[PDB]
Design a protein around this nucleic acid. Structure first.
Ligand code: NA
Ligand code: NA
Ligand code: NA
Ligand code: NA
Length: 328
DNA sequence: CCGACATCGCATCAGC
DNA sequence: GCTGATGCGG
DNA sequence: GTCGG
């Protein structure tokens, strides 16, 4: 991809606008509009010279073209400069960086005078469990995870899962599975031959419990019968700086829907969009759970049997593609 | 013009 | 107390 | 905010 030096000024501007839409104005669709614009621009191999030039790109409309014209001629955007200095808005926007604190909680906090982590620290009683954890690890959670650490994390997860029951099947998905050099968190998909879409409730708990027993999992954000969201940390060596705490999610999925799950959670997002498109034009409907045939009138039929990622590709006459080649 | 922009598990709130 | 809505995250 | 039926 082109160096940020090309249109970084523009993409940074659009991303900042995106955050305020989401966190302050609570306009999620505008947040995504701005993100989409930033992405299409971020991949444009030419230094943009005008809003008109950018408008030709899908996702960039009249308004963003105008803002780009203003940024190119002045080196800034008045509305953004203004919002940045706004003490209330900048505080609301900031607080949402705490996991567990969304637009609603952030606005409530600021309305009562709680505007900083310091203020949050002084008001533990007004934070729920999730938020306290997000605060506790505010810094760690914003750090990325090197692939080498992800490999050490995977070693632990796979080992402990097999130790609980050798029949469990666990797959670390996400960009990591596509071979990325760094990850933002760890996403683990878990299944067991004993759990199917039509056949019975503690399969997840036993794995979470073992990971806690060996002190890999350190905190729990949420945990149910099919989904666990929490925190983990690699063991540190003597006299060695401790590793940052990391976010890890573990999902229990029915065996017959496992590979549709692995495919989906491996992505990338652009690849899934494409594959779902091709699958459609081929007469199939693919979601994170199953792949079903589409009748003449568009009536989806029963889900087709899947025993591997390949089965999916085969159904839609597509050559199986390696995770490292699913960038798009 | 004006609706879509994904959908759902879990924690917690709001209403009865 | 139970049931549905909301907030949040992914 | 952008797209498109
Ligand atoms: Na455009
Ligand atoms: Na956030
Ligand atoms: Na947050
Ligand atoms: Na065994």
């Amino acid at each position: 991809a082109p160096q940020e030096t090309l249109n970084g000024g523009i993409t940074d501007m659009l991303t900042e606008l995106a955050n305020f839409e989401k966190n302050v104005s609570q306009a999620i669709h505008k947040y995504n509009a701005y993100r989409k614009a930033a992405s299409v621009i971020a991949k444009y191999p030419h230094k943009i010279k005008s809003g008109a030039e950018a408008k030709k790109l899908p996702g960039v409309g009249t308004k963003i073209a105008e803002k780009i014209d203003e940024f190119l001629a002045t080196g800034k955007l008045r509305k953004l400069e203004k919002i940045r200095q706004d003490d209330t808005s900048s505080s609301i926007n900031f607080l949402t960086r705490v996991s567990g604190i969304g637009p609603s909680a952030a606005r409530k906090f600021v309305d009562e005078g709680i505007k900083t982590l310091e203020d949050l620290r002084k008001n533990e009683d007004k934070l729920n469990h999730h938020q306290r954890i997000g605060l506790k690890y505010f810094g760690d959670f914003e750090k990325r995870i090197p692939r080498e650490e992800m490999l050490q994390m995977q070693d632990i997860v796979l080992n402990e899962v097999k130790k609980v029951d050798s029949e469990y099947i666990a797959t670390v998905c996400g960009s990591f599975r596509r071979g990325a050099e760094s990850s933002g968190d760890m996403d683990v998909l878990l299944t067991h031959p004993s759990f199917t879409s039509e056949s019975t409730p503690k399969l997840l708990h036993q794995v979470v419990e073992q990971l806690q027993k060996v002190h890999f999992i350190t905190d729990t954000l949420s945990k149910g019968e099919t989904k666990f969201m929490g925190v983990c940390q690699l063991p540190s060596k003597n006299d060695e700086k401790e590793y940052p705490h990391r976010r890890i999610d573990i999902r229990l999925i029915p065996k017959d829907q496992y590979y549709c799950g692995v495919l989906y959670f491996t992505g990338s997002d652009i690849f899934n969009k494409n594959m779902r498109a091709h699958a459609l034009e081929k007469g199939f409907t693919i979601n994170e759970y199953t792949i079903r045939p589409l009748g003449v009138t568009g009536v989806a039929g029963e889900p087709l049997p899947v025993d591997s990622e390949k089965d999916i590709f085969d159904y839609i006459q597509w050559k199986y593609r390696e995770p490292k080649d699913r960038s798009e």
